[PDB]
Coordinates of C-alpha atoms in Angstrom, one line a residue:
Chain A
X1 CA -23.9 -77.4 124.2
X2 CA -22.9 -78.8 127.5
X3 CA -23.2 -82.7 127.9
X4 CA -22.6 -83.1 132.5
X5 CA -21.8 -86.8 132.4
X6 CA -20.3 -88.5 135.7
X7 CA -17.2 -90.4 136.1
X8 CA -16.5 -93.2 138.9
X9 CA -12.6 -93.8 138.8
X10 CA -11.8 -96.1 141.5
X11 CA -8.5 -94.8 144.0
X12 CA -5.5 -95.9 141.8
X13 CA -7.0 -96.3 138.0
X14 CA -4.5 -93.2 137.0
X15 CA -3.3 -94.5 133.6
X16 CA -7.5 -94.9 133.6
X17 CA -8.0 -91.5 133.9
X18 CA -5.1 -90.4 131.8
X19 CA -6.6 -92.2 129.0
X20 CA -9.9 -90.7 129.7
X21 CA -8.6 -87.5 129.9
X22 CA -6.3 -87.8 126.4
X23 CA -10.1 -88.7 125.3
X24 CA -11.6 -85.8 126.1
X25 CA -9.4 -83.9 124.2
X26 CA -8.9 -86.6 121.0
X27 CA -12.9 -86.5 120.7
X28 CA -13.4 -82.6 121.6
X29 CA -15.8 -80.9 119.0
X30 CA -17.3 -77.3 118.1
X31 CA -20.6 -79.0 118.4
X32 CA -20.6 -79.8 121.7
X33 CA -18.6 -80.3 125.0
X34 CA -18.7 -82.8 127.9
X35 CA -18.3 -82.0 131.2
X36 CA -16.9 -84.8 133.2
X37 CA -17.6 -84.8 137.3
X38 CA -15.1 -87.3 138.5
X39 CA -15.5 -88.9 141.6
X40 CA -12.9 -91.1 143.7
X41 CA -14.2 -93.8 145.9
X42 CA -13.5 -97.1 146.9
X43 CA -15.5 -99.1 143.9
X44 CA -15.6 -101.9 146.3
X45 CA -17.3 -100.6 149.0
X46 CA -21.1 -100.8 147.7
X47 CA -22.4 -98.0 149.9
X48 CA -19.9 -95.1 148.7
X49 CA -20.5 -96.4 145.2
X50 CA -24.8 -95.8 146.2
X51 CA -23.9 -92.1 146.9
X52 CA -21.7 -91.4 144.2
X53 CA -24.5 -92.6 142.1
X54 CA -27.0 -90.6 143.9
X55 CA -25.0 -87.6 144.1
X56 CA -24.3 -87.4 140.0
X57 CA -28.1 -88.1 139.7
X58 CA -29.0 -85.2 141.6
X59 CA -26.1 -83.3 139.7
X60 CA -28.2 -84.1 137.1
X61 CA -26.1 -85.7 134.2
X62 CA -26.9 -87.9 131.0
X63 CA -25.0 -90.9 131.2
X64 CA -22.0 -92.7 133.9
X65 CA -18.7 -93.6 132.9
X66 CA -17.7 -95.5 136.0
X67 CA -16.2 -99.3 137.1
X68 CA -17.6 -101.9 139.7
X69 CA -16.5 -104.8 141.9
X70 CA -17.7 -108.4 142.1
X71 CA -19.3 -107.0 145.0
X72 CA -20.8 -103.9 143.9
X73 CA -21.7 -104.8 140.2
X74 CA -25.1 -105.6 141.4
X75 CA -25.6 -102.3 142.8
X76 CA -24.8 -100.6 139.4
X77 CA -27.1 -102.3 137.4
X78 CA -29.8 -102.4 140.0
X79 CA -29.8 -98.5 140.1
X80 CA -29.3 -97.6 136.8
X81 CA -32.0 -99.9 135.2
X82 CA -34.7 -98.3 137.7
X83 CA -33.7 -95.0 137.2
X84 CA -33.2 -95.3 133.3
X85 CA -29.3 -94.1 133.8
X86 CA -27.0 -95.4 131.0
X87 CA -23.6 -96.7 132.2
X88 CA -20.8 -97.1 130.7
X89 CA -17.9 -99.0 132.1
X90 CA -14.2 -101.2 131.2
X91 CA -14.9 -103.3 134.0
X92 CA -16.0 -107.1 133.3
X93 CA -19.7 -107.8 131.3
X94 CA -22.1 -108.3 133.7
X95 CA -23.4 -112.2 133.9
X96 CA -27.1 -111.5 132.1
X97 CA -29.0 -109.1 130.0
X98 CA -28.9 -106.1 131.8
X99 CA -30.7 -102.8 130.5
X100 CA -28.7 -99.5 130.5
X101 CA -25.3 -100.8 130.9
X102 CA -22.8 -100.4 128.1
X103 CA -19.8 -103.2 128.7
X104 CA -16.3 -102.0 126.8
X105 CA -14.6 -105.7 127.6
X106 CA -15.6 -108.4 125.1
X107 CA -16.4 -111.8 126.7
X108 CA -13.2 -113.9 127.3
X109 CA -14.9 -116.9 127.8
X110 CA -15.3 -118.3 124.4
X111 CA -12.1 -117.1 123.1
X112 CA -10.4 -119.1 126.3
X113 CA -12.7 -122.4 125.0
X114 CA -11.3 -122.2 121.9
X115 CA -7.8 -121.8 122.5
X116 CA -8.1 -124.9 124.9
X117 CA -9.5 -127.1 122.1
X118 CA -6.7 -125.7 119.7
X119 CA -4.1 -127.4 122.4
X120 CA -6.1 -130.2 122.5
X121 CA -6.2 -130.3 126.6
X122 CA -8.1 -133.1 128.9
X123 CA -6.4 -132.5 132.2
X124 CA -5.3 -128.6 133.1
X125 CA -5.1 -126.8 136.2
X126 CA -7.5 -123.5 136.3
X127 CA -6.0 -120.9 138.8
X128 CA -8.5 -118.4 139.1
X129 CA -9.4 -114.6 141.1
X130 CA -13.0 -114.4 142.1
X131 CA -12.5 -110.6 141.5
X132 CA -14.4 -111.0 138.1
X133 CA -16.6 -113.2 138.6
X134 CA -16.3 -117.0 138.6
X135 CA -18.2 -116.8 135.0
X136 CA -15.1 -118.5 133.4
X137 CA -15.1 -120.8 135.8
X138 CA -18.6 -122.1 135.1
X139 CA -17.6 -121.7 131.9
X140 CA -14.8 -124.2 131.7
X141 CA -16.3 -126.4 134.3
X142 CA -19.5 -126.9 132.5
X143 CA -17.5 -127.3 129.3
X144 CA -15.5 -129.7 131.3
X145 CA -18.5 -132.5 131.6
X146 CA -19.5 -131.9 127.7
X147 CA -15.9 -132.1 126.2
X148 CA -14.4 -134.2 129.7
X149 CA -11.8 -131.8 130.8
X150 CA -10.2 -133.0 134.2
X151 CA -10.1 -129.6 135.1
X152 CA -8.5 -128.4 139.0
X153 CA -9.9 -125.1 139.8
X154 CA -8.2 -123.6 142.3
X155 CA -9.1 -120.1 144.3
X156 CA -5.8 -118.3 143.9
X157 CA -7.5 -115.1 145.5
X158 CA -8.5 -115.3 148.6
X159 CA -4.7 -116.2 149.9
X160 CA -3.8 -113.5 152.1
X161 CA -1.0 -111.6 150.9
X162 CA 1.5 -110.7 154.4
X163 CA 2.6 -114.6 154.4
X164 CA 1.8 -116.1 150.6
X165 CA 4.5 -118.2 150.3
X166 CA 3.5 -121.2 152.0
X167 CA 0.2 -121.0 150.2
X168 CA 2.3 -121.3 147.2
X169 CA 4.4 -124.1 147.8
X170 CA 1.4 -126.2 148.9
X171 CA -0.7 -124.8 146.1
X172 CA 1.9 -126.3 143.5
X173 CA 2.2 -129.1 145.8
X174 CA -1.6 -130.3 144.8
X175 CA -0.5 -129.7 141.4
X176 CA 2.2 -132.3 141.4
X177 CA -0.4 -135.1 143.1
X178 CA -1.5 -135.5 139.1
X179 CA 1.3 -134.3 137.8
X180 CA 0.2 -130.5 136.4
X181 CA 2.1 -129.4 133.6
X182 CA -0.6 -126.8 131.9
X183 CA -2.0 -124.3 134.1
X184 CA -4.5 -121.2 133.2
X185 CA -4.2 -118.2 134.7
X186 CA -7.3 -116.3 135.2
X187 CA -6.1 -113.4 137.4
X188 CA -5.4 -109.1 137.1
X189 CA -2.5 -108.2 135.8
X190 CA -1.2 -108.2 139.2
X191 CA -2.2 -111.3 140.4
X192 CA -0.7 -112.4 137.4
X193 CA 2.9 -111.1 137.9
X194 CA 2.5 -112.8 141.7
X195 CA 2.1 -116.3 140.1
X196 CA 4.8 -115.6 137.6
X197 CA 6.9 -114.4 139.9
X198 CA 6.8 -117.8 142.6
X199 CA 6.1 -119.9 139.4
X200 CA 10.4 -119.0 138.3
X201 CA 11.6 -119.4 142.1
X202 CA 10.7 -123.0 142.2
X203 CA 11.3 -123.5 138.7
X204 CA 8.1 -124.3 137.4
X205 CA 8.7 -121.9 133.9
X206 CA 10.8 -124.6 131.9
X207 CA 10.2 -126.7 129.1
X208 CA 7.2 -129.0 129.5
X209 CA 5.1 -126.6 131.1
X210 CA 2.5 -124.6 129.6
X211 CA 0.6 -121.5 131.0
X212 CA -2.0 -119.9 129.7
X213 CA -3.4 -115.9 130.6
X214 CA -7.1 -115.7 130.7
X215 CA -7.0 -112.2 130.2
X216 CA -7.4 -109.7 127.1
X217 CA -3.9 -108.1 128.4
X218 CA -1.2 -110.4 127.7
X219 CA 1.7 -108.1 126.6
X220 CA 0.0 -105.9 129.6
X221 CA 2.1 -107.6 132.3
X222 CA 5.9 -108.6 132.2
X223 CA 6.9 -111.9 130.1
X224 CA 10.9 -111.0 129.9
X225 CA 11.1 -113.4 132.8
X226 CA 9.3 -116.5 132.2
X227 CA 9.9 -115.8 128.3
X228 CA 13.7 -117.4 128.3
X229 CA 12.5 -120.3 131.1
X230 CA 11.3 -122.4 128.3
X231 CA 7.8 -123.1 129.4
X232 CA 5.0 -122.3 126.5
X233 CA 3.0 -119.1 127.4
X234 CA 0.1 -118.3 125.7
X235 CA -2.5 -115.7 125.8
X236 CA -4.9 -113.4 124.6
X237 CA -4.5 -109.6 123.2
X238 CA -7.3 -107.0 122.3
X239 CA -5.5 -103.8 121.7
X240 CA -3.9 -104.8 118.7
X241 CA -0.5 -102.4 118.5
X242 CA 0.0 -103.5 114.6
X243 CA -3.0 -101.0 113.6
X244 CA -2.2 -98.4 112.0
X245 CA -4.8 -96.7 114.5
X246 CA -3.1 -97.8 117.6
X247 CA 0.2 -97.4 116.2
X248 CA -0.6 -93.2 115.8
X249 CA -2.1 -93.7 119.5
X250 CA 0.7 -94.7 121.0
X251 CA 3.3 -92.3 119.0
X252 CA 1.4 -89.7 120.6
X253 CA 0.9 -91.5 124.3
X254 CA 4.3 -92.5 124.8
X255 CA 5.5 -89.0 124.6
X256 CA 3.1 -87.4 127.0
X257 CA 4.3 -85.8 130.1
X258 CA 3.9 -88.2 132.8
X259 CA 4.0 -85.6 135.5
X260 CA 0.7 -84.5 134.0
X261 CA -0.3 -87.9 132.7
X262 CA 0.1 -90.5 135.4
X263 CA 1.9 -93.8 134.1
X264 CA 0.8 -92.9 130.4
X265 CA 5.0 -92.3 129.5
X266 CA 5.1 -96.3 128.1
X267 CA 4.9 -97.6 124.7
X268 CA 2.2 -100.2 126.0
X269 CA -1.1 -99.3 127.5
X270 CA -3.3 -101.4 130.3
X271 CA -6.5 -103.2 128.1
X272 CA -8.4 -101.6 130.7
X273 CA -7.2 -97.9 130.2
X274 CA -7.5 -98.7 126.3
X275 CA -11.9 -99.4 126.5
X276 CA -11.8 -96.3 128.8
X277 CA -10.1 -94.2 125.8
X278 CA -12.8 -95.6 123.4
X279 CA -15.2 -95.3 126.3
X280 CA -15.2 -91.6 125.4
X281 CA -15.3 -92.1 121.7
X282 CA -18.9 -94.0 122.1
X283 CA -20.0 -91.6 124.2
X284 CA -19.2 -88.7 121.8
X285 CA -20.4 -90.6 118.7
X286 CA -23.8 -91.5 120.9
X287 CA -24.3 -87.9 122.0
X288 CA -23.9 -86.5 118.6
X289 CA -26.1 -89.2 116.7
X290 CA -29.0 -87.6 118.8
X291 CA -27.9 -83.8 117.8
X292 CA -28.4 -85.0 114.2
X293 CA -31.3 -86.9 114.8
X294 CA -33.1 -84.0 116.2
X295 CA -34.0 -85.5 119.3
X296 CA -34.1 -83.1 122.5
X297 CA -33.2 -84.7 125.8
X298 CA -31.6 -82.0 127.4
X299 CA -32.5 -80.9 131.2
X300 CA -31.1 -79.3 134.2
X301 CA -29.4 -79.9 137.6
X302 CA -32.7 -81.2 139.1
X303 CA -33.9 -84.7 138.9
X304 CA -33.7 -85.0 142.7
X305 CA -32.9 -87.2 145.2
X306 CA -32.9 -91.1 143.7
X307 CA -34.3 -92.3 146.6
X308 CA -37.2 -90.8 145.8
X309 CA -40.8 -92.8 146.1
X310 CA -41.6 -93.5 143.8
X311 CA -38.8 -93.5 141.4
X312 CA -39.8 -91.9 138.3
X313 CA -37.3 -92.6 135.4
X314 CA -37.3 -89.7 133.0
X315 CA -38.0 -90.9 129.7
X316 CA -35.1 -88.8 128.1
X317 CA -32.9 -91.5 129.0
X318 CA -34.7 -94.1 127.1
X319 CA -32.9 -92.1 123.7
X320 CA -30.0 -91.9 125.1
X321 CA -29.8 -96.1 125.6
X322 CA -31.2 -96.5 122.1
X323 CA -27.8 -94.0 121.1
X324 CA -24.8 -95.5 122.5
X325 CA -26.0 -98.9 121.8
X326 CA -26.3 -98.0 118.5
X327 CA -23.0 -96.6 118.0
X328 CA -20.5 -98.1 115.5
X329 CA -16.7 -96.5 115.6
X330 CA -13.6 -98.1 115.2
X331 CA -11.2 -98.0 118.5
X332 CA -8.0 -99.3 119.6
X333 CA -9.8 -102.5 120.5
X334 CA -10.7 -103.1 117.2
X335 CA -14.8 -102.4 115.8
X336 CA -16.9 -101.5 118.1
X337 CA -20.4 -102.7 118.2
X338 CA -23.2 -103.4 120.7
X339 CA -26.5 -105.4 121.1
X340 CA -29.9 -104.7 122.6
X341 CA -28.0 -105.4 126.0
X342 CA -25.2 -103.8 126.0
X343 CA -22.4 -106.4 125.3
X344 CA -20.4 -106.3 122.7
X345 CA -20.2 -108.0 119.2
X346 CA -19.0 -108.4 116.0
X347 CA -15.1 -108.1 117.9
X348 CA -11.7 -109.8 117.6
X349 CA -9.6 -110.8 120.3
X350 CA -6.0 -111.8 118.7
X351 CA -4.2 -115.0 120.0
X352 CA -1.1 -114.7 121.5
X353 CA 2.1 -117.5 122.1
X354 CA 5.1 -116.1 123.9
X355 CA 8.5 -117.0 121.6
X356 CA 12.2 -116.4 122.1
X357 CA 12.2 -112.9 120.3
X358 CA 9.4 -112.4 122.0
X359 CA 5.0 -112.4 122.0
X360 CA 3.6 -113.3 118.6
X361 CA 0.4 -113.2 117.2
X362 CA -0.6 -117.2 116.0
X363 CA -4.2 -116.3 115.0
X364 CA -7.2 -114.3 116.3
X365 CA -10.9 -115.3 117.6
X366 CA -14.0 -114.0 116.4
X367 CA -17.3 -114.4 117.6
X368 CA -18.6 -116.6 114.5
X369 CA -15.7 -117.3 113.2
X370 CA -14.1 -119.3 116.7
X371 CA -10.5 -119.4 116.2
X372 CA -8.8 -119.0 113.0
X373 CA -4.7 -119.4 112.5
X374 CA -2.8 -116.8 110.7
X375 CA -0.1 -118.7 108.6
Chain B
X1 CA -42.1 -99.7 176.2
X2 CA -42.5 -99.3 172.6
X3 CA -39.2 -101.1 170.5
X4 CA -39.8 -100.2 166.3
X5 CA -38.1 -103.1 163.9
X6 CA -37.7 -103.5 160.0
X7 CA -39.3 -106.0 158.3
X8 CA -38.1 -106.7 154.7
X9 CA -40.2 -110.1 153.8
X10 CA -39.6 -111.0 149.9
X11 CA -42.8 -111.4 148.7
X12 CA -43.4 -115.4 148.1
X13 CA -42.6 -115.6 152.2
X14 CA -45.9 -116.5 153.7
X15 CA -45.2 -119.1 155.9
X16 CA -41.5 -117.3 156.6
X17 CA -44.2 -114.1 157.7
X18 CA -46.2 -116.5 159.5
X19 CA -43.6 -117.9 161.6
X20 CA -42.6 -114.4 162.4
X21 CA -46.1 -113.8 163.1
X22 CA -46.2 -117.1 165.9
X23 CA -42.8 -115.7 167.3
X24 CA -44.4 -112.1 167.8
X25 CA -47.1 -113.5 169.7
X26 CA -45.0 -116.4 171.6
X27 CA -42.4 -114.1 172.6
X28 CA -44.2 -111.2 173.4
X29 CA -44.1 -109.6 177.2
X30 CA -45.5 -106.9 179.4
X31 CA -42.0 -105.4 179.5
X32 CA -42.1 -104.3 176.4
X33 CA -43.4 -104.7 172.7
X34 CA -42.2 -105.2 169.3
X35 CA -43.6 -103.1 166.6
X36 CA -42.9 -104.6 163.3
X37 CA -42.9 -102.5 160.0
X38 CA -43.9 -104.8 157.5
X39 CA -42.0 -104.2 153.6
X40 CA -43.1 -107.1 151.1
X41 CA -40.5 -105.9 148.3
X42 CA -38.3 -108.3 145.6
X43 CA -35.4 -109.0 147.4
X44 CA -33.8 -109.5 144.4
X45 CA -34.0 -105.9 143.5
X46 CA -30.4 -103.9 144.7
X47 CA -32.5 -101.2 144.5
X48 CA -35.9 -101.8 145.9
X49 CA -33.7 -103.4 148.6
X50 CA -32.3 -99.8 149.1
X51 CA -35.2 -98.1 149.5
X52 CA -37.0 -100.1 152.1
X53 CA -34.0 -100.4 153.9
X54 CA -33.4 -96.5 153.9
X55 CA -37.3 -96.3 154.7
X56 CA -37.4 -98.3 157.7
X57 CA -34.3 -96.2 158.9
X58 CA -36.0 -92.8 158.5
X59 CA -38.8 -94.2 160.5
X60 CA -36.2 -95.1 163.5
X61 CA -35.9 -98.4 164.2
X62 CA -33.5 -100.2 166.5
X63 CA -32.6 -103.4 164.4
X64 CA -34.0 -105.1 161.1
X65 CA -34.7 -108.0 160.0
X66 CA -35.2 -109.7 156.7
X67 CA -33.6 -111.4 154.0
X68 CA -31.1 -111.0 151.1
X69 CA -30.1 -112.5 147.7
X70 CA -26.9 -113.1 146.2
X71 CA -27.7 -109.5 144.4
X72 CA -28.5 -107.6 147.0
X73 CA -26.5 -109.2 149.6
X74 CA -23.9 -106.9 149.2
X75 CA -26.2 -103.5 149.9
X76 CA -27.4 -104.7 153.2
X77 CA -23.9 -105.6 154.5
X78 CA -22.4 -102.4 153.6
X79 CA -25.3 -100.1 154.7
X80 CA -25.5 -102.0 157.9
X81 CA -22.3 -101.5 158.5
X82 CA -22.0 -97.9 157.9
X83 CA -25.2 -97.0 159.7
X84 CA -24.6 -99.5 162.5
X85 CA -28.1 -100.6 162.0
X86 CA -28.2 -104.8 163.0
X87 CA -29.9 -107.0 160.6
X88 CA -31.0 -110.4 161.7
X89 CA -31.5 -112.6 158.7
X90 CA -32.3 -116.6 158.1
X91 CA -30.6 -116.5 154.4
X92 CA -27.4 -117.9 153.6
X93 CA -24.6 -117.0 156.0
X94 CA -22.1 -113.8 154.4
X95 CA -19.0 -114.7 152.6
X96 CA -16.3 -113.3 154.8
X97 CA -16.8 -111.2 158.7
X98 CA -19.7 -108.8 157.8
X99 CA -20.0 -106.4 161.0
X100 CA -23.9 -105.5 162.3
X101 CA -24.9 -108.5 160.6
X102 CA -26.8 -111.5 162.5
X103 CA -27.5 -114.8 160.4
X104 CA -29.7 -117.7 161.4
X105 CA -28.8 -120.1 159.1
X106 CA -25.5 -122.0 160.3
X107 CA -22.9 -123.1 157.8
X108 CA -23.2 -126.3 156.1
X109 CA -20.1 -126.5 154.2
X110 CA -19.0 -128.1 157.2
X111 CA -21.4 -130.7 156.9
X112 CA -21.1 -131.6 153.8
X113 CA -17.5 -132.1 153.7
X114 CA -17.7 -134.3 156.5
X115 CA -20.5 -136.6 155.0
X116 CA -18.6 -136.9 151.9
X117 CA -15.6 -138.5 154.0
X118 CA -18.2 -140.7 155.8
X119 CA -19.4 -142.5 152.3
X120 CA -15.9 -142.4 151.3
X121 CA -16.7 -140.3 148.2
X122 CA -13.7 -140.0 145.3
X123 CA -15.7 -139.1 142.1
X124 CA -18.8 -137.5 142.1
X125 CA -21.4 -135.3 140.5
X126 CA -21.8 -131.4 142.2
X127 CA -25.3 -129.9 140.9
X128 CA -24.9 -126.9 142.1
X129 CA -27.0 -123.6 142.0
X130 CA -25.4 -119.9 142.1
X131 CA -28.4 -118.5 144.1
X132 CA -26.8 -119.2 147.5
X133 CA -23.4 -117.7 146.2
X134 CA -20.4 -120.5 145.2
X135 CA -19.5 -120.3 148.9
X136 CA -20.5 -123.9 149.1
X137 CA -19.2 -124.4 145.0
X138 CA -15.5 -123.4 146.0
X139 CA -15.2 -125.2 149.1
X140 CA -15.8 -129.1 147.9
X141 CA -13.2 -127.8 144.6
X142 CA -10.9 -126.7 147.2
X143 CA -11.1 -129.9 148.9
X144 CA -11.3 -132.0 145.9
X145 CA -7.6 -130.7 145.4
X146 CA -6.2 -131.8 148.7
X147 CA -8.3 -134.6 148.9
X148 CA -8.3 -135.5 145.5
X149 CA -11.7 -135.9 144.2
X150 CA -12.6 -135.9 140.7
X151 CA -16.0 -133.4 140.9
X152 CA -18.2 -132.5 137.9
X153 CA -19.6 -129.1 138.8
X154 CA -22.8 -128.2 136.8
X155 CA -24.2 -124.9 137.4
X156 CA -27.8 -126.5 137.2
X157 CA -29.4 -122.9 138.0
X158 CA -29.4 -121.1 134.2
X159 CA -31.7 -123.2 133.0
X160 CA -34.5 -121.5 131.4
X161 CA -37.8 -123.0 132.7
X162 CA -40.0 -122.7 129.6
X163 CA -38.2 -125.4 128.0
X164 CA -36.3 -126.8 130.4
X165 CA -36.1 -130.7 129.2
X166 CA -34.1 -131.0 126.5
X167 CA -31.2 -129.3 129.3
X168 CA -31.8 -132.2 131.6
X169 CA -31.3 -134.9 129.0
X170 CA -28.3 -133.5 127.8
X171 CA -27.3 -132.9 131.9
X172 CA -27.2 -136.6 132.4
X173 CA -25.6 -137.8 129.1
X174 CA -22.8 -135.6 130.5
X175 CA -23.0 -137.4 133.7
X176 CA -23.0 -140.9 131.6
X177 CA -19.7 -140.5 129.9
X178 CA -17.9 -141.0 133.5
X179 CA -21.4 -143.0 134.6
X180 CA -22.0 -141.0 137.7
X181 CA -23.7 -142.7 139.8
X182 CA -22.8 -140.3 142.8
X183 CA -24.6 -137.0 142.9
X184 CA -25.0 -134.1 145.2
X185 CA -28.1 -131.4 145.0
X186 CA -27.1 -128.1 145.9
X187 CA -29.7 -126.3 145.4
X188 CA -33.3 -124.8 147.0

């Protein structure tokens, strides 16, 4: 039983692939095998990601593992809707309901809400990276006229990086106008470090300030620096290393060769590199729910070119929707569960509050249960 | 002389078709003629959008022209680019220096942030709608922070239509808590 499924690992996801990889072999069965055809391109670029679409559609394969852009998202779910092509992917959920797309990232955006409320803010500046999507941003803007939030978004991203430093000191320069002492930072982990990094030259880290990560990797990124400064950081974590689960994850990761596995040699792992781990572990569980369901989808190298007009979508991919959307495992972020759509439910994202000795869990967020403090 | 164009028209675009129509016929010269290759597809559709641009290309023509939305915007820009084909389009300028890539429709950011000055404009109301992309959206917040304007952003577009009343009443008791009397209509 061989399963071709394609991969689309943008150039420089190695601790990614790594964890894809340490998958393959975590989630390996007698039963049946999958053979991944990993492509590198530029996930930016919309046109590469069209062919490297195209090209594992002709190469005839049952489902996509891949990530997309702000820019390229569209084409993604555009293709793979039409041509009844499941795809599954870390990157951020896509801003709707669509079909044949299965999201691994749980939506930030009412666990950021929440924490808010718990802090009881009315005037906070939001730093944010249109790299995801300014769907948070609607989302505390329009929350901003309901529970009056004198919010000041600010596009941190489009400040060009051979000469940042003057951005900076006038960026922090509007945020003295009113005063700014609480600032949310909804950027990459790198973007992140950036701000940390120029928010501790001009002394912005120390008591009185409070900063708060929008992003599900908080103990992703370094806090060693801003952690003694004395300003309150806060933020949010979804691969939860107190599980007994992770815990045996990690005992095993952080003693793999990293000659062999790429920046996988670390205690920690990227929230991103964690969903593509239990990425695979859908997959498999999807796969093998239609083995036992005696349902035959299989095919061959041959669907042709997906340009083709008309497009015919072969129905053996409405089964396989209907089986990773089903599928109901436990991972290292947390249970695992999925809607009609594709987006994920019935999850908790932890809350996080840097201390003194270090990050702390102060309570956890779930999806009808909004915030709720553990003593 | 005999020049083949692309035609993507989203399908809705009558009078857009029959102003290209008018121009084809007020334009037109012994010199040489333009022979347009109709495609009425939804321009929403990344994919559709693919196709009929693909389409037009196999059949050789020299530049295209249609339109885009803030889906499919992205597929158009990047295949023009890489194929060097020229597209000429009225819709919403691109976000950023799009090569191969001619647009009709001048910026208004510009405009607006000008205007805004003129009434003197501190705190107002920005009803916005996230079809054109938040190109306009991120420039009056980027301005409210140096000019220091207190803006309520409402992404007015979500709004299911088949119900769409019990939205607007709750839209304006938001807009009643600060009494906003001063609101701008972003929108189609």
């Amino acid at each position: 039983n061989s399963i071709q499924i394609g991969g689309l690992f943008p150039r420089g996801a190695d601790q990614e692939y790594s964890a894809f990889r340490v998958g393959m072999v975590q989630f390996s069965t007698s039963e049946f095998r999958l053979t991944p055809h990993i492509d590198n391109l530029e996930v930016a670029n919309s046109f590469a990601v069209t062919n490297a679409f195209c090209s594992q559609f002709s190469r005839g394969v049952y489902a996509i593992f891949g990530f997309y852009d702000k820019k390229s998202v569209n084409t993604i779910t555009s293709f793979c809707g039409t041509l009844h092509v499941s795809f599954i992917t870390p990157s951020f959920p896509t801003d709707g309901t669509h079909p044949f797309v299965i999201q691994m990232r749980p939506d930030l955006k009412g666990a950021l809400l929440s924490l808010i409320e718990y802090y009881q803010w009315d005037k906070f500046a939001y730093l944010y990276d249109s790299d995801r999507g300014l769907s948070t941003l609607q989302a505390v803007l329009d929350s901003a006229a309901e529970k009056k939030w004198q919010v000041t978004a600010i596009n941190v991203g489009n400040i060009n990086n051979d000469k940042k430093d003057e951005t900076y000191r006038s960026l922090f320069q509007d945020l003295e106008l009113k005063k700014e002492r609480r600032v949310i930072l909804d950027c990459e982990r790198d973007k992140v470090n950036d701000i940390v990094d120029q928010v501790i030259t001009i002394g912005k880290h120390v008591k009185g300030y409070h900063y708060i990560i929008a992003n599900l990797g908080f103990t992703d990124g370094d806090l060693l620096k801003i952690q003694f400064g004395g300003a309150e950081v806060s933020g949010f974590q979804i691969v939860d290393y107190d599980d007994s689960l992770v815990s045996k994850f990690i005992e095993r990761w952080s003693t793999l060769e990293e000659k062999e596995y790429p920046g996988a040699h670390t205690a920690t792992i990227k929230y991103t590199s964690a969903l593509t781990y239990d990425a695979v572990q859908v997959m498999t569980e999807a796969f093998r729910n239609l083995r036992k369901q005696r349902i035959e989808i299989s095919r061959r190298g041959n669907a042709g070119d997906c340009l083709a007009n008309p497009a015919v979508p072969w129905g053996q991919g409405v089964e396989i929707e209907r089986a990773l959307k089903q599928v109901q495992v436990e991972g290292l972020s947390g249970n695992i569960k999925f809607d009609q759509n594709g987006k994920r439910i019935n999850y908790t994202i932890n809350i996080m509050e840097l201390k003194t000795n270090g990050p702390r869990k102060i309570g956890y967020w779930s999806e009808v249960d909004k915030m709720v403090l553990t003593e």
